[PDB]
Amino acid sequence: MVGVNFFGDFDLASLAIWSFWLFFALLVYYLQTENMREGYPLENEDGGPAVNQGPFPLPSQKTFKLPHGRGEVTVPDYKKEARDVALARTAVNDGFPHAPTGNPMLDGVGPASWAPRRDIPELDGHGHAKVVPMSVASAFFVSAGRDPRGLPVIANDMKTVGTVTEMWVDVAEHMVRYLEVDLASGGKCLVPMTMAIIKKHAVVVQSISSAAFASVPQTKSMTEISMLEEEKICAYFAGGTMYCADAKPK
Amino acid sequence: EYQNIFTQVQVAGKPELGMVEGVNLENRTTGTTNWPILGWFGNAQLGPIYLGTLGTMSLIFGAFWFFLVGVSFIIQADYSPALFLRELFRAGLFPPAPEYGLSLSAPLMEGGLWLIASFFLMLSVLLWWARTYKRAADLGMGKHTAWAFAGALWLMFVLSFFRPILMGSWSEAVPYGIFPHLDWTNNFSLTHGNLFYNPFHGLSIAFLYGSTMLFAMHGATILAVSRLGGERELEQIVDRGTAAERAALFWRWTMGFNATMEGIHRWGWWFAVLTPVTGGIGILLSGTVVEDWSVWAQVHGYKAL
Amino acid sequence: SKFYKIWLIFDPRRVFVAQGVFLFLLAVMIHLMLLSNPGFNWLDISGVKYERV
Amino acid sequence: SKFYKIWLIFDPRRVFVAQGVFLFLLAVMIHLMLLSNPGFNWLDISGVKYERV
Amino acid sequence: SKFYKIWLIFDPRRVFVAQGVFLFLLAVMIHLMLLSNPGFNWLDISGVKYERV
Amino acid sequence: SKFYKIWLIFDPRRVFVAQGVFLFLLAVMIHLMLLSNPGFNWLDISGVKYERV
Amino acid sequence: SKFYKIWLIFDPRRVFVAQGVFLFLLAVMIHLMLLSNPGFNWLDISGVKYERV
Amino acid sequence: SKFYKIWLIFDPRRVFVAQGVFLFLLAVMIHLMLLSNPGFNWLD
Amino acid sequence: ALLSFERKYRVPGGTLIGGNLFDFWVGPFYVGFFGVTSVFFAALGTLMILWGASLGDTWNPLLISINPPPLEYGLGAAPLREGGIWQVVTLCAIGAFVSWAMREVEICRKLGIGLHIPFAFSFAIFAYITLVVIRPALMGAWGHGFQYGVFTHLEWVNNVGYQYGNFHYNPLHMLGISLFFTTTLALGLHGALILSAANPETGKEMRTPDHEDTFFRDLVGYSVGTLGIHRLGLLLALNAAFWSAMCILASGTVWFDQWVFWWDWWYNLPFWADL
Amino acid sequence: AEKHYLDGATKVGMATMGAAAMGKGMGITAVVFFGTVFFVVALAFIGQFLPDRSREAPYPNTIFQVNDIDGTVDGKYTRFA
Amino acid sequence: DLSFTGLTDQQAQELHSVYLQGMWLFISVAIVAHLAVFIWRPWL
Amino acid sequence: DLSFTGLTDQQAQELHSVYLQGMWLFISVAIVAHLAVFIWRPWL
Amino acid sequence: DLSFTGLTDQQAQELHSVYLQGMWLFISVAIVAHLAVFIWRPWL
Amino acid sequence: DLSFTGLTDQQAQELHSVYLQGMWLFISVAIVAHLAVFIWRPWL
Ligand code: BCL
Ligand code: BCL
Ligand SMILES: CC[C@H]1c2cc3[nH]c4c(c3C)C(=O)[C@H](C(=O)OC)c4c3nc(cc4[nH]c(cc(n2)[C@@H]1C)c(C(C)=O)c4C)[C@@H](C)[C@@H]3CCC(=O)OC/C=C(\C)CCC[C@H](C)CCC[C@H](C)CCCC(C)C
Ligand SMILES: CCCCCCCCCCCCCCCCCC(=O)OC[C@H](COP(=O)(O)OCCN)OC(=O)CCCCCCCCCCCCCCCCC
Ligand SMILES: COC(C)(C)C/C=C/C(C)=C/C=C/C(C)=C/C=C/C(C)=C/C=C/C=C(C)/C=C/C=C(/C)CC/C=C(/C)CCC=C(C)C
Ligand SMILES: COC(C)(C)C/C=C/C(C)=C/C=C/C(C)=C/C=C/C(C)=C/C=C/C=C(C)/C=C\C=C(\C)CC/C=C(\C)CCC=C(C)C
Ligand SMILES: COC(C)(C)C/C=C/C(C)=C/C=C/C(C)=C/C=C/C(C)=C/C=C/C=C(C)\C=C/C=C(/C)CC/C=C(/C)CCC=C(C)C
Ligand SMILES: COC(C)(C)C/C=C/C(C)=C/C=C/C(C)=C/C=C/C(C)=C/C=C\C=C(C)/C=C\C=C(\C)CC/C=C(\C)CCC=C(C)C
Ligand SMILES: COC(C)(C)C/C=C/C(C)=C/C=C/C(C)=C\C=C\C(C)=C\C=C\C=C(C)\C=C\C=C(\C)CC/C=C(/C)CCC=C(C)C
Ligand SMILES: [Fe+3]
């Protein structure tokens, strides 16, 4: 097929490349609409439907079946977020930040925002609780690196809030996910391993002040943790990265 | 701040032997070792493997192809273990010369051994493809891995099976040396004008770059939202948490549009798969349809003059 | 005869968008076919007919 | 005869869309084959027949 | 006749946006086609007509 | 006619921003097209007319 | 006219930011275009005018 | 005249910092535009 | 138009330079101080590209090319039609790329999350800056940068590649290619595995992350894990960028012959030197 | 004081605040700019000590005669070669 | 009463009649165009 | 009396009238410019 | 009473008045500059 | 009133007067620089 052309200089190669462009436009349409199964329809800044919705219409509903008798999930769901957010707009126009109306960390807004997940523990493939204290797992042991248990924990101001007393591990993926802190405040606390640095003398948490440690979102039980509790704890620390940054030295 | 790049403390319990969802357990080995130098980066368990009919057959055919390439090297070294080691990268098992066309009648040390080895290499990759399919089927999973592997195999087969047949000569297939197949790539671009002016070579590069860039972006995104239960990507697909939301809002605020937890993997799947799919198309058209991509670009208005 | 009931199975929105896109692309390609042929390129044909229009 | 039961097994939406796509592509490739062959290229044939039409 | 019921099926916002974009793109394509053709490129035509305007 | 009812469909802010962007890009493109043509490049024309201005 | 009602539509903070960005960008562009033309590059014009300024 | 009302919409601290940045950037544009011209570069 | 969960994240704070002066959104886009600078740099660079195109003879967006100054200007600022437009665009490109990263930092600070994304993009920026700044400075001429054009910068890639014979024989180039190929393979496998678990065979419940560990352990004997695959993809892509930049930096600065002759250290080892 | 100035002093406290802020912005910009210029100048200086064959590489860009904006239609940077 | 699409039967009837009217208009215009083109430059 | 934008019918009318005045002013300036350009360098 | 920005009609009028004074000053300076440049080197 | 910055009317006037003093000082130094350069190497 060399030198033999359709249409007067339109080749099998020209045909192939134009065919690819057509297919790729269709694939971009497909990919974009697949990626619209969360967060749509667009809202306005008062919780009502937005005037504009974009060139791409929403995809057809798709269902996920969940193992271990945890029902079905269909998306896009067209539902609005199932939590109230203690903000208030700073301008009558659009495109400007909304300001917290109370304590941003206690209310759960901004970088401290939590999503309303189900109040049940995430499960492993065998239907057991996926993240548990090692007192429950009981076959897990420290394999390498330094064990943080017994070390003092130091907040983002250089003050010690307590000691590491327990690790919470993921039994499916063999990982430590939380450090249980016993507080001199008087109670206990879970700290995400992703937010703690273990050193020889202490575990240092550079996101949360010592006063913040007095109010960390609690868990109902000390043998399992729900996805909602996980969201609240991790959101509290990630929000501290903004709302506690002034307590740092200097 | 802890960058989730390396694990701080490793932990280990009973070794995990796998899910049982229709896998023939007697084809799954039983021995795992736990290697902590890997546990700094990823999992420490060197787990069991599954070994059934397809895997055994694929390994036999591939190992025999490997062996035959090695034997050819030994023979062309004139038996010298010194030349064999000195030329481990510079030697190749080359296809038959052009005068033999597509016939199976070329001397054993001038393409015949190349043909035999190529046949067994063909057999093993197809059996490995069937393996990728059947391991998914035995667990009840979708077939995305096998489809993605089919795209890469398509580039492989246009390289040495489809295009040499359409050109009428085994002599255009790629040799089995480390340095000689790079020489083959350079020669291929040089004989077909310049392969930069091949639009499907351009599109293949775009998807290679984009797949590298996309997985820089996605790995960085997941690591950045790891403070939240971020890398548990499954279960964020069905129960959206703040990790998925903040990941979406980062890219929405940055570039004006975002993906979803499930859908970023479709983008990556398609960008990765389209690299060999589009590349194979461009090689197939080279020589068969276009002889000189430079003059073709000049005629099609994207090379000057 | 009774082809209408297809609208009970195929959603008219997708059908109409698909038909519009296909019809436009087909028309574009037929015109480009004719323009690339120097026997049906009306611009150059008129240039010749009217002595450089 | 009794073939209607195939519509109990194959979803008509998928089958109809697939068949439309396939028929269109087949027709396009046959026309392109005819155009590429300079014995059935009707534009050039008519150009020759009417002395540049 | 009674084409108006299309607005009962297609959302006006998307349709109007798409029509505006398509019409502008089509007009641009045609103008560029004419400028690319050196028989309908009106700038050079005027340059010749007025003897280097 | 009564085109004002467009403002029941489209938000004025979005339309005004889109219109401004469109008009700016259009004006830039037309001026650049004129300047690239040495029949409407006013800087060089004035250089010629005034003997290097 | 009564164009003051633009400020019932567009907020002044963002409008002023966008206006400053656009105006500075346009001024820089026009000056750059003049510098690139060898009839309106004032530095070289003054170089010629005074025999190397 | 009433241009002082600009400080009712834009906070003066931030504007002062931004204006320092902008003025230095404008200066570097002008200086190295001058360096681009052979007849006005002062290094040599 | 906000996503249905977006509102609770649109709070003040996280900025680096100008406080609340630019702390607002335009549509989806956060602006901030570096949004202003990135927009200005991007617009000015695009608009100088268009102006440079106007001075040529084509408006075809595949033939437009802005060329660096000739070598005789060295590292000086060139006349604006003799390479100066290229330098202006290059400075605008650096300004916009760096501003884009700083804007990404501010968005990460507002949504309190790690800074991995701007870090990775900075690796991409470093590859670009190696191409247009670092290597031409060491060689002593801006004209060793690559011309800006959809298909003419490929002419640069070609000419520089064939200056050192076949560029394949560049060990850092080999390392970079392997990292590009491997990151593409890893993206394919990771996307496929996620999609397979989320989209099972028809009628089956959704698969668990145990099933996907099991899938790779069955297929190859090893599973890096969910956290591990993202660390791996990130570092693979970053290393590909860095070793590509080292590849090109070495050529013409510290190595000058055909890259094939570099391996003569192995081929001329004295025991098998003469064989 | 829920205002960065309240009493202000109306001519001197405000003037010092504004001088401090504008000088801070200009000073950080100056630091960044001169660091970058110094880095480039250092790279050029170092490149002066590379082997002489670092100055033998030919011009790596192709001039296509349709992108040649020098003033003459020749396909090259005129007045040099 | 299977409705993949939610239309009632008579809604499908009206929709089909309108669609057919539009189709016939398009086809008639194309027929006239083809006759004009065939007179101007015949291609069979 | 429903609308996508939330504007009342009266609000849309005054909006449109002011917008039309602006468009007409823009167009009249463009018209004067085109007459000037055509007298200076006719393109038809 | 249509108000997106939150202003009242009076504040919009006052703001527009000050804005127009700024714009007219800028345009007057630009006009003077263009007249000077046209005398120095005419471009039409 | 229309106060985004939280200043009062009187604070804005005073800060504007200080800003004007600083800006005229900057412009006067710039004028001296331009006169020196123009004497040295005139660009018009
Ligand atoms: C002088 C050299 C030429 C050139 C000549 C070629 C040629 C020739 C080809 C490419 C191809 C490619 N080129 Mg090149 N190319 C050049 C310049 C470049 C530049 C550059 C910056 O200059 C870049 C980035 C690229 C990039 C690329 C890739 C996008 C593309 C391969 C895609 C792919 O999937 O590969 C990786 C994937 C594969 C190789 C598929 C096969 C792998 C199989 C599946 C492996 C299975 C297992 C195996 C059998 C056994 C071992 C396993 C055991 C465990 C041990 N080219 C210049 C112009 N290029 C290819 C292409 O697609 O072109 C259109 C191709 O054939
Ligand atoms: C004749 C040609 C030579 C050759 C000569 C060269 C030369 C010369 C070079 C390479 C380089 C590379 N080559 Mg080689 N190469 C050849 C053959 C190959 C083959 C092959 C199969 O044959 C392959 C796979 C490769 C592969 C590669 C990569 C390792 C590398 C390019 C990646 C890179 O730099 O990313 C780095 C990524 C970037 C620079 C991108 C930066 C992006 C910036 C930050 C953002 C831009 C935004 C944009 C303006 C925005 C637009 C806005 C829109 C809204 C989107 N080469 C042959 C043998 N190759 C290059 C390299 O290593 O460069 C460092 C290089 O210079
Ligand atoms: C989307 C496109 C990308 C991609 C996709 C892809 N590749 C894939 C997959 C996918 C989705 C798989 O599922 C499959 C896989 O299983 O991956 C883990 C595979 C895979 N891609 C691979 C490689 C690969 N992919 C490449 C490319 C890419 N693959 C693309 C970039 C490349 C490149 C860039 O060149 C390579 C080299 C493999 C890891 C794997 C396929 C496994 C395979 O082919 O097995 C066949 C087996 C053999 C040839 C047997 C070899 C046996 C040993 C030599 C035995 C040694 C014995 C002893 C040392 C002695 C030997 C000699 C004698 C004495 C015996
Ligand atoms: C001066 C010229 C300017 C252009 C020339 C530059 C070259 C362009 C080539 C690549 C195109 C990049 C342009 C990307 C546009 C960025 C703006 C953007 O995408 O956001 C706008 C839009 C709105 O977002 P949203 O409202 O959320 O959409 C869903 C609601 N219905 O968001 C969307 O549209 C969502 C759809 C996402 C679009 C998918 C992106 C495709 C990128 C894949 C390219 C890879 C292959 C490229 C091959 C290159 C070959 C050379
Ligand atoms: C193509 O390239 C080139 C660049 C050739 C041509 C480009 C031309 C362009 C586009 C140029 C753009 C020029 C512009 C937009 C210039 C804007 C200049 C401005 C607004 C300058 C304002 C300066 C204001 C200052 C310095 C204010 C200082 C205020 C203070 C409070 C400082 C405090 C210190 C004192 C002493 C205050 C005085 C107080 C008392 C009590 C005396
Ligand atoms: C030959 O090359 C060709 C290729 C050049 C390239 C392109 C050719 C083509 C296709 C050109 C097509 C051009 C088009 C589509 C042009 C259309 C232009 C339009 C629609 C211009 C409209 C301008 C409208 C303006 C300026 C409107 C209003 C301005 C105002 C100041 C009104 C203010 C509004 C207010 C105050 C509303 C507030 C009211 C209330 C009640 C709050
Ligand atoms: C100590 O024992 C031994 C002897 C181990 C020492 C061994 C040394 C060894 C094993 C050396 C091996 C070295 C190398 C360099 C192996 C790798 C070579 C490369 C670069 C391979 C890349 C190949 C690329 C492609 C596209 C290969 C094949 C593609 C196909 C489609 C295969 C099918 C093609 C044909 C013609 C099948 C023929 C079928 C019939 C019926 C004739
Ligand atoms: C390119 O050259 C060669 C010759 C290579 C190859 C030729 C290839 C082939 C196969 C060409 C023919 C392809 C086909 C299948 C053509 C058939 C087209 C058909 C069946 C069109 C059917 C209906 C046409 C219209 C225009 C339908 C409805 C009326 C409208 C006004 C369109 C928009 C309205 C829609 C979509 C529904 C709502 C109804 C109204 C009235 C608004
Ligand atoms: C070759 O030709 C090329 C290619 C150049 C293409 C041509 C492109 C062009 C020229 C495109 C268009 C340019 C356009 C359409 C418009 C420019 C408009 C301008 C110059 C607007 C300038 C306005 C200046 C102003 C408003 C100055 C304001 C200063 C002030 C102090 C105003 C203070 C304002 C207020 C509201 C104070 C606050 C009051 C209260 C009560 C809060
Ligand atoms: Fe992932």
PDB file of C-alpha atoms in Angstrom, chain A residues 31-128:
ATOM      1  CA  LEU A  31     -13.088   8.785  30.785  1.00  0.00           C
ATOM      2  CA  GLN A  32     -14.412  12.196  31.792  1.00  0.00           C
ATOM      3  CA  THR A  33     -17.932  10.915  32.324  1.00  0.00           C
ATOM      4  CA  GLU A  34     -16.662   7.917  34.306  1.00  0.00           C
ATOM      5  CA  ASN A  35     -14.855  10.378  36.595  1.00  0.00           C
ATOM      6  CA  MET A  36     -18.102  12.236  37.371  1.00  0.00           C
ATOM      7  CA  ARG A  37     -19.565   9.575  39.674  1.00  0.00           C
ATOM      8  CA  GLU A  38     -18.633  11.533  42.812  1.00  0.00           C
ATOM      9  CA  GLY A  39     -19.482  15.126  43.646  1.00  0.00           C
ATOM     10  CA  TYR A  40     -22.197  15.772  41.089  1.00  0.00           C
ATOM     11  CA  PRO A  41     -24.467  17.551  40.461  1.00  0.00           C
ATOM     12  CA  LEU A  42     -22.578  20.793  41.116  1.00  0.00           C
ATOM     13  CA  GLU A  43     -24.039  22.972  43.858  1.00  0.00           C
ATOM     14  CA  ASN A  44     -23.967  26.655  44.626  1.00  0.00           C
ATOM     15  CA  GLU A  45     -22.388  28.081  47.732  1.00  0.00           C
ATOM     16  CA  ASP A  46     -25.649  27.820  49.703  1.00  0.00           C
ATOM     17  CA  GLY A  47     -26.285  24.096  49.248  1.00  0.00           C
ATOM     18  CA  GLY A  48     -28.648  24.449  46.296  1.00  0.00           C
ATOM     19  CA  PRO A  49     -28.147  23.266  42.724  1.00  0.00           C
ATOM     20  CA  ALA A  50     -25.711  25.227  40.599  1.00  0.00           C
ATOM     21  CA  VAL A  51     -26.816  27.180  37.541  1.00  0.00           C
ATOM     22  CA  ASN A  52     -24.056  25.694  35.372  1.00  0.00           C
ATOM     23  CA  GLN A  53     -23.300  21.972  35.285  1.00  0.00           C
ATOM     24  CA  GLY A  54     -20.669  21.632  32.558  1.00  0.00           C
ATOM     25  CA  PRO A  55     -20.577  20.252  29.021  1.00  0.00           C
ATOM     26  CA  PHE A  56     -20.477  16.618  30.172  1.00  0.00           C
ATOM     27  CA  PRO A  57     -23.720  14.988  31.346  1.00  0.00           C
ATOM     28  CA  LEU A  58     -23.699  12.553  34.228  1.00  0.00           C
ATOM     29  CA  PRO A  59     -23.100   8.837  33.582  1.00  0.00           C
ATOM     30  CA  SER A  60     -25.637   6.078  34.089  1.00  0.00           C
ATOM     31  CA  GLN A  61     -25.927   4.628  37.560  1.00  0.00           C
ATOM     32  CA  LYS A  62     -23.556   1.790  38.417  1.00  0.00           C
ATOM     33  CA  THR A  63     -23.762  -0.570  41.382  1.00  0.00           C
ATOM     34  CA  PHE A  64     -21.115  -2.105  43.619  1.00  0.00           C
ATOM     35  CA  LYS A  65     -21.892  -5.205  45.657  1.00  0.00           C
ATOM     36  CA  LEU A  66     -20.177  -5.255  48.958  1.00  0.00           C
ATOM     37  CA  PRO A  67     -18.860  -8.407  50.646  1.00  0.00           C
ATOM     38  CA  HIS A  68     -19.745  -9.617  54.127  1.00  0.00           C
ATOM     39  CA  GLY A  69     -23.371  -8.523  53.906  1.00  0.00           C
ATOM     40  CA  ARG A  70     -22.684  -4.795  53.542  1.00  0.00           C
ATOM     41  CA  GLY A  71     -25.287  -4.079  50.886  1.00  0.00           C
ATOM     42  CA  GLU A  72     -24.932  -2.256  47.604  1.00  0.00           C
ATOM     43  CA  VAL A  73     -23.596   1.125  46.531  1.00  0.00           C
ATOM     44  CA  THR A  74     -24.859   2.923  43.431  1.00  0.00           C
ATOM     45  CA  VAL A  75     -23.060   5.909  41.912  1.00  0.00           C
ATOM     46  CA  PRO A  76     -23.612   8.627  40.968  1.00  0.00           C
ATOM     47  CA  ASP A  77     -25.926   8.833  43.958  1.00  0.00           C
ATOM     48  CA  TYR A  78     -27.257  12.394  43.409  1.00  0.00           C
ATOM     49  CA  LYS A  79     -27.320  12.763  47.202  1.00  0.00           C
ATOM     50  CA  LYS A  80     -25.971  15.713  49.120  1.00  0.00           C
ATOM     51  CA  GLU A  81     -23.404  15.414  51.889  1.00  0.00           C
ATOM     52  CA  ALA A  82     -24.871  13.980  55.087  1.00  0.00           C
ATOM     53  CA  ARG A  83     -23.205  16.342  57.574  1.00  0.00           C
ATOM     54  CA  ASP A  84     -23.645  19.978  58.526  1.00  0.00           C
ATOM     55  CA  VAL A  85     -20.642  22.266  58.122  1.00  0.00           C
ATOM     56  CA  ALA A  86     -20.244  25.160  60.564  1.00  0.00           C
ATOM     57  CA  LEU A  87     -19.032  27.715  58.050  1.00  0.00           C
ATOM     58  CA  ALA A  88     -20.381  31.061  56.910  1.00  0.00           C
ATOM     59  CA  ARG A  89     -19.569  32.874  53.692  1.00  0.00           C
ATOM     60  CA  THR A  90     -17.362  35.966  53.851  1.00  0.00           C
ATOM     61  CA  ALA A  91     -18.800  37.622  50.732  1.00  0.00           C
ATOM     62  CA  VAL A  92     -22.065  37.794  48.821  1.00  0.00           C
ATOM     63  CA  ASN A  93     -20.289  37.045  45.541  1.00  0.00           C
ATOM     64  CA  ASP A  94     -18.881  33.617  44.722  1.00  0.00           C
ATOM     65  CA  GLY A  95     -15.322  32.369  44.748  1.00  0.00           C
ATOM     66  CA  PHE A  96     -14.315  33.612  48.201  1.00  0.00           C
ATOM     67  CA  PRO A  97     -13.505  31.555  51.303  1.00  0.00           C
ATOM     68  CA  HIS A  98     -16.094  30.702  53.913  1.00  0.00           C
ATOM     69  CA  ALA A  99     -15.013  31.345  57.444  1.00  0.00           C
ATOM     70  CA  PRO A 100     -15.412  28.968  60.388  1.00  0.00           C
ATOM     71  CA  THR A 101     -18.116  30.071  62.800  1.00  0.00           C
ATOM     72  CA  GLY A 102     -16.538  28.365  65.812  1.00  0.00           C
ATOM     73  CA  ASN A 103     -13.498  26.229  66.527  1.00  0.00           C
ATOM     74  CA  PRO A 104     -12.372  24.902  63.118  1.00  0.00           C
ATOM     75  CA  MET A 105     -10.763  21.796  64.636  1.00  0.00           C
ATOM     76  CA  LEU A 106     -13.676  20.845  66.894  1.00  0.00           C
ATOM     77  CA  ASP A 107     -16.273  21.599  64.219  1.00  0.00           C
ATOM     78  CA  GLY A 108     -14.394  19.655  61.570  1.00  0.00           C
ATOM     79  CA  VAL A 109     -14.012  22.163  58.749  1.00  0.00           C
ATOM     80  CA  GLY A 110     -11.234  23.174  56.407  1.00  0.00           C
ATOM     81  CA  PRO A 111      -8.160  20.947  56.636  1.00  0.00           C
ATOM     82  CA  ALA A 112      -9.877  19.378  59.649  1.00  0.00           C
ATOM     83  CA  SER A 113     -12.876  18.300  57.569  1.00  0.00           C
ATOM     84  CA  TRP A 114     -14.138  14.759  57.982  1.00  0.00           C
ATOM     85  CA  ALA A 115     -16.451  12.954  55.538  1.00  0.00           C
ATOM     86  CA  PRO A 116     -19.466  11.088  57.008  1.00  0.00           C
ATOM     87  CA  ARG A 117     -18.417   7.477  56.478  1.00  0.00           C
ATOM     88  CA  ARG A 118     -20.173   4.446  57.916  1.00  0.00           C
ATOM     89  CA  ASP A 119     -19.832   3.824  61.650  1.00  0.00           C
ATOM     90  CA  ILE A 120     -18.552   0.269  61.148  1.00  0.00           C
ATOM     91  CA  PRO A 121     -15.047  -1.173  60.963  1.00  0.00           C
ATOM     92  CA  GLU A 122     -13.399  -1.767  57.626  1.00  0.00           C
ATOM     93  CA  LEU A 123     -13.000  -5.499  57.084  1.00  0.00           C
ATOM     94  CA  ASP A 124     -10.323  -7.730  55.653  1.00  0.00           C
ATOM     95  CA  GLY A 125     -10.994 -10.463  53.094  1.00  0.00           C
ATOM     96  CA  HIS A 126     -12.078 -12.913  55.806  1.00  0.00           C
ATOM     97  CA  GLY A 127     -14.639 -10.611  57.427  1.00  0.00           C
ATOM     98  CA  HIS A 128     -12.635  -9.641  60.512  1.00  0.00           C
TER      99      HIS A 128
END
